[PDB]
Structure formats: structure tokens, C-alpha cells
Amino acid sequence: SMGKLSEHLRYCDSILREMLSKKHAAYAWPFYKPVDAEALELHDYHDIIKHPMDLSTVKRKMDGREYPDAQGFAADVRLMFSNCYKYNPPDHEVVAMARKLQDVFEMRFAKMP
Numbered sequence: 001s002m003g004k005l006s007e008h009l010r011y012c013d014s015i016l017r018e019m020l021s022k023k024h025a026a027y028a029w030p031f032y033k034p035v036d037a038e039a040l041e042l043h044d045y046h047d048i049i050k051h052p053m054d055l056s057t058v059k060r061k062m063d064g065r066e067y068p069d070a071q072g073f074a075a076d077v078r079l080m081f082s083n084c085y086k087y088n089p090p091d092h093e094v095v096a097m098a099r100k101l102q103d104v105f106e107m108r109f110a111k112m113p
């Protein structure tokens with residue numbers, strides 16, 4: 001009722017709900033919550049990744065309407081993927097998992113009306 005920007009943000013809300021849903025859990029689960037570098041014994045993670053990002057943080061910010069437009073939302077989602085590509089060996093399973101989830105994200109985002 002408030003126009004294209006309101007509709008875009010609601011569509012992005014729906015993308016996020018799908019990425020968090022059981023449908024994609026085989027590959028999305030490493031991205032549900034912030035990386036716990038202490039628990040994973042990754043003593044270099046925060047030295048390499050300066051801006052951690054994950055789906056629960058995107059959800060908090062999106063629910064608080066902290067993204068001014070859909071491009072702001074997309075930047076944080078893509079930052080999450082980019083962190084995974086930057087930190088891990090390129091042939092690691094987690095990179096393939098990030099790419100499977102990004103395939104979903106980019107497909108849905110491309111079809112935003």
C-alpha cells in the first residue's frame with residue numbers, strides 16, 4: 001500500500017525466511033548464526049574476517065528495518081558469502097555449501113518484482 005520500496009523490503013523478508021527454512025538446511029546451516037571462532041578453535045578467523053555476518057544478524061537488522069533498501073540487505077547477505085570464500089580453502093565443503101545457498105539467494109533476488 002506504500003509502494004515499490006515497501007514491497008521490495010517485504011520480498012527480501014521472504015527471501016530471508018526461505019534461506020532459514022528447513023528446505024535448505026542441508027547447506028544453509030553454517031550460516032544460521034555468527035561463527036563461534038572460540039568453539040571452532042579458529043584462532044585466526046577474526047584476524048582475517050573483519051566484518052562477520054550471518055543470517056540471524058541479517059534477520060535482526062531487516063526486522064528492525066535497518067536496511068534502507070533492498071540493495072543494503074543484499075550487501076550484507078553477499079558479505080556473509082564473501083567471508084566464507086575469503087577465509088576457507090577454495091575446495092572446502094563449506095565453500096560449496098555457501099555457493100549452494102548463494103545460488104538460491106541470487107535466483108530469488110533476481111526475480112524481485
Ligand SMILES: CC[C@@H]1C(=O)N(C)c2cnc(Nc3ccc(C(=O)NC4CCN(C)CC4)cc3OC)nc2N1C1CCCC1
Pocket residue numbers: 029030031035040042045083084087088094
Ligand atoms: C568459520 C569457517 C567456516 C565458515 O566459513 N563458516 C561460515 C562456518 C560456520 N559454522 C561452522 N560450524 C561447524 C563446523 C564444523 C563442525 C564440526 O562438527 N566439525 C567436526 C569436528 C570434529 N572433527 C574434526 C570432524 C569435524 C561444527 C560446527 O558447528 C558446531 N563452520 C564454519 N566453517 C568451517 C569451520 C572449520 C571448517 C569450515
